[PDB]
Design a protein around this nucleic acid. Structure first.
Ligand SMILES: [Mg+2]
Ligand SMILES: [Mg+2]
Ligand SMILES: [Mg+2]
Ligand SMILES: [Mg+2]
Ligand SMILES: [Mg+2]
Ligand SMILES: [Mg+2]
Lengths: 153, 262, 206, 59
RNA sequence: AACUGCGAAUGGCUCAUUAAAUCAGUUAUGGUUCCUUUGGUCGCUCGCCACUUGGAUAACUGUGGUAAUUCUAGAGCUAAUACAUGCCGACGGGCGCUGACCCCCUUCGCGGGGGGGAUGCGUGCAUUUAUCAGUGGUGACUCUAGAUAACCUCGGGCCGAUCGCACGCCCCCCGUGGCGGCGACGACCCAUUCGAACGUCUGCCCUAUCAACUUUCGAUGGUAGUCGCCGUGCCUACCAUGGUGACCACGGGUGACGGGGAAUCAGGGUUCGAUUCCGGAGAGGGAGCCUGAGAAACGGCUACCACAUCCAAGGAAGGCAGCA
RNA sequence: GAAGCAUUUACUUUGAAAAAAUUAGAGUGUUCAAAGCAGGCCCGAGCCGCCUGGAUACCGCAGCUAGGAAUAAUGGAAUAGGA
């Protein structure tokens, strides 16, 4: 519900909240300033990252990761394991002797920031390489594309 | 390996050194310096293999220890000192004043320049940054750190510095239509005029170059050394002028030359 | 020795991997500092590259910042009162990077009295008279009194900080890593996180 | 033992200090006039752009 | 001879281990360390020896011990670019807070708007926090530089108590001082070179008479730490219940080090690669360390295990997968 | 020319980058050759030396780049939440 659900106070490290709030200000409404950055490579910052209130230190827009290296794509298959999803990347492997292909796949775990709210199984995501964020996570979700949906019953 | 390597096997040496096979197990192993290992020419092979002023390494060592070999105006007594590109070697007992620039086969050619030309060199800007107390610096393609440069100078431009002061004399910007030399890769040693630079964010920029004969080629931005304002080089180009001949027309030229002199 | 390598963990699939080399010197660890509160005791350790680190073993003073007033003063650390990692780090009084401590408030209130000229942290007043009256009044000149009044109109402090200054001890948070740098520095808790941590400390009580 | 060689070395060290602080002063002054002339040019180009705006706002 | 410095982490040997491991191509450090070389920087700090401070210890002399070793004890000296300790100069001040006082002001009784300022307290780079503003730069900084408040570890950061070769120049105040060229060595820091380490993507032989594995004792992820050169379950605490698999996980085998390559020879392909180049790993087997920029080193040390040498039986010394 | 592509891929062609050695291959009478990377030309002699080489190709798959767009996959307006 609220964002302070941990044992330690959750805050963006580069925002000073206690900026001498005195009688000349309104009580309220006050809204504490939000740190966000523009990652390069022509990727738009989602508006939910602009005026959201989540704290995520591994978010590419409001956190302390920097995207560099490889930009890949895949299809969401699991959405357990909080703030992290499993995507599947299918590809064809060429075998020279029979001069045909075979179908292979690899899973990678990627960090899904809470600026992407309506993410479902079967969606196509764009991921960017960052520094190691955990034992197995090295990529971070940059853009979510819906697949054959947008209309429900 | 538990630490840094100090040897270099003979077949693992750079190919453009043109070392043979049967005369040893080892290669000269250039010392640490202002040039990279694969992109340099240690003094021993320049003095023994190209100029043939010596026949062994001991002869190289004693003509170095007699303290007349000058690289960029300073006396160097280290026989495996990396000489590197666009660097001036002055003997000034015999009075040669070479300069190290690639020929069109990608190899360091013997190129004699005049004594008035040996005062300066061209350096390529690889970094600009502001040091403490707000004073700017730049780092060249050598290890040279120039303080207080012109504020118009940006990265991967070239600057003409003069030796024995280290000061910047003049510069040209990396711009479309300027003369350049390729300093690495497949087109190493070729000279042409910049026509296009298309940018790839994250990745490397590729620059398209057209030479005098209209043979257009492309290479990475890191292998571009601008050498002249628009069309006129600021240094003396070597024999062949950076124009790469195909094997057929080079065969024809060689046959015509041996027919004239034979 | 103690090692922080990777090749002893299981694979992502859960499979067990075999080591292909002995443990190297570059992948070592060291015993934790476990910095406590006491007279200053710092041991240096020679680290990779020949550089230095500082195991702060016992610390008593620190450099804390008010932040809202931009006043940084060296002050004494009294106690450890909350820790988000472990409660035993509280009950054994261990100084780590994100622990919540109690610091002496006299340098901050002394700066406040010297700067704004209002009595701060006084229960009933007129008790420490031969120092406080001369440090508040000065019988000062006119224009300097005007600039002091201009400071005075923006001198309100929040009630939580007010009652903390009455108690003489302020709640602070470490920001450095003792045992790596040898120092325990930080900032004074204010505002929403002061309310948050006060609520937490209240919550463990009963 | 104090020797006139030792005193000569001390004088040499002080002279190196003198020449490098003179170097710093000269380099800083030259760069000051360079930063005058450059971006004096950039200011006059911005003024030229403003004058171009004024020229194309009255036709 | 000995102290100090440096090197001894390269080279050489072998292929036991090792199956997404090693390794190859690709890419990354905006997530780190780096002796040396090269280029910057080295009066930027206001603060009763400096024409040079202090104590030792080798080699040396001499008295010895032990059966025995590159074993060492006791006594007497003496050095430093070893070990320490510590000025002067620049140095005139400037800048930022502090402000007793003094002057010109609406003036009328005041409200006054501007100015000088005595006295204090701090100042440079590096470190560790916190705040403010937004000189250069990237595709993208919580970058670089700036400003402020402080801190700055006695197993304690810089701010030269070092050494050669030429020997010259100024003298009034006054001839006894003061100045000077070229190096060597040295340095905290920045860059550079040589790298190293950790990561990204794709790629490996046979086996199902190996089909479900992993997860108490970290397995997958989250939050806060600890440690580390840094990113990370690397480790700890508290949480969540994850992660992988017939597109063959997990397990087992290999008479498996990987690759560049080699043999065969229509086109396809099948075998081989211990072996001179590159990468890895090991030094009888495991384990743990010291020193250093760099080693978990074995022509370093410590311990156990297995072999094994000398002994006067108290002890001592070992490591050819270097060349013979 | 700053920006973007009215889907995204596979495919195909091009361009960069894929150590050297080995292989293919150019030049060169090791006395021939296997090799090697060398060599060749005038001296009536000052000649106080001249010319020239040490190419090129290939380097699977994966990754990067620019043209094509047939073939093959895929996507957009149906409760219109359409342009
Ligand atoms: Mg050493
Ligand atoms: Mg084996
Ligand atoms: Mg092999
Ligand atoms: Mg090898
Ligand atoms: Mg080893
Ligand atoms: Mg060992």
């Amino acid at each position: 519900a609220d964002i302070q659900t941990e044992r330690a106070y959750q805050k963006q490290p580069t925002i000073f909240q206690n900026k001498k709030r005195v009688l000349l200000g309104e009580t309220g409404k006050e809204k504490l300033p939000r740190y966000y950055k523009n990652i390069g490579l022509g990727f738009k910052t989602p508006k939910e990252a602009i005026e959201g209130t989540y704290i995520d230190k591994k978010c590419p827009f409001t956190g302390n990761v920097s995207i560099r290296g490889r930009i890949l794509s895949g299809v969401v298959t699991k959405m357990k394991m909080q703030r992290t999803i499993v995507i599947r990347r299918d590809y064809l492997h060429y075998i020279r002797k029979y001069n045909r292909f075979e179908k292979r796949h690899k899973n990678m775990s990627v960090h899904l920031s809470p600026c992407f709210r309506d993410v479902q199984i079967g969606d196509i995501v764009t991921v960017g390489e960052c520094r190691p964020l955990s034992k197995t996570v090295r990529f971070n979700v940059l853009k979510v594309t819906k697949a054959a949906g947008t209309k429900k019953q | 390996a538990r630490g840094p390597k100090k040897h270099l096997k003979r077949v693992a040496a750079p190919k453009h050194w043109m070392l043979d096979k049967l005369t040893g197990v080892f290669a000269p192993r250039p010392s640490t310096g202002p040039h990279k290992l694969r992109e340099c020419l240690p003094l021993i092979i320049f003095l023994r293999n190209r100029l043939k002023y010596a026949l062994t390494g001991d002869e190289v060592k004693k003509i170095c220890m007699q303290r007349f070999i000058k690289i960029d105006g300073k006396v160097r007594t280290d026989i495996t000192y990396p000489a590197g590109f666009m660097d001036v070697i002055s003997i000034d007992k015999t009075g040669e004043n070479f300069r190290l620039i690639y020929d069109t086969k990608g190899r360091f050619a013997v190129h004699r320049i005049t004594p008035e030309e040996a005062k300066y060199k061209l350096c390529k800007v690889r970094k600009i940054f502001v040091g403490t107390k707000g004073i700017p610096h730049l780092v060249t393609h050598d290890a040279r750190t120039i303080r207080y440069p012109d504020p118009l100078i940006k990265v991967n431009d070239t600057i003409q510095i003069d030796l024995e002061t280290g000061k910047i004399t003049d510069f040209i910007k990396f711009d479309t239509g300027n003369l350049c030399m390729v300093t690495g890769g497949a087109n190493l040693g070729r000279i042409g005029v910049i026509t296009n630079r298309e940018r790839h964010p994250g990745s490397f920029d590729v620059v398209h170059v057209k030479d005098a004969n209209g043979n257009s080629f492309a290479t990475r931005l890191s292998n571009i050394f601008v050498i002249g304002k628009g069309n006129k080089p600021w240094i003396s180009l070597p024999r062949g002028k950076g124009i790469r001949l195909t094997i057929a027309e080079e065969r024809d030229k060689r046959l015509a030359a041996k027919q004239s002199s034979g | 020795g103690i090692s922080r390598d990777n090749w002893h963990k299981r694979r992502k699939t859960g499979g067990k991997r075999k080591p292909y080399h002995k443990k190297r010197k570059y992948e070592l660890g060291r015993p934790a500092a476990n910095t406590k509160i006491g007279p200053r005791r710092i041991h240096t350790v020679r680290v990779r590259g020949g550089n230095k680190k500082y195991r702060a073993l016992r610390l008593d003073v620190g450099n804390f910042s008010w932040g809202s007033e931009c006043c940084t003063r060296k002050t004494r650390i009294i106690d450890v009162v909350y820790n988000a990692s472990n409660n035993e780090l509280v009950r054994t009084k261990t100084l780590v990077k994100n622990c919540i401590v109690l610091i002496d408030s006299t340098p901050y209130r002394q700066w406040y009295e010297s700067h704004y000229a209002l009595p701060l942290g006084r229960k009933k007043g007129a008790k420490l008279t031969p120092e406080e009256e001369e440090i508040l009044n000065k019988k000062r000149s006119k224009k300097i009194q005007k600039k002091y009044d201009e400071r005075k109109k923006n001198a309100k402090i929040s009630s939580l900080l007010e009652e903390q200054f009455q108690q003489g001890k302020l709640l602070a948070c470490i920001a450095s890593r003792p045992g790596q740098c040898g120092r325990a520095d930080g900032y004074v808790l204010e505002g929403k996180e002061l309310e948050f941590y006060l609520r937490k400390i209240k919550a463990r009580k009963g | 033992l104090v020797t006139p060689r030792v005193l000569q070395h001390k004088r040499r060290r002080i002279a190196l200090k003198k020449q490098r602080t003179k170097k710093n002063k000269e380099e800083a002054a030259e760069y000051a006039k360079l930063l005058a002339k450059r971006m004096k040019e950039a200011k006059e180009k911005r003024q030229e752009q403003i004058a171009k705006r004024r020229r194309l706002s009255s036709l």
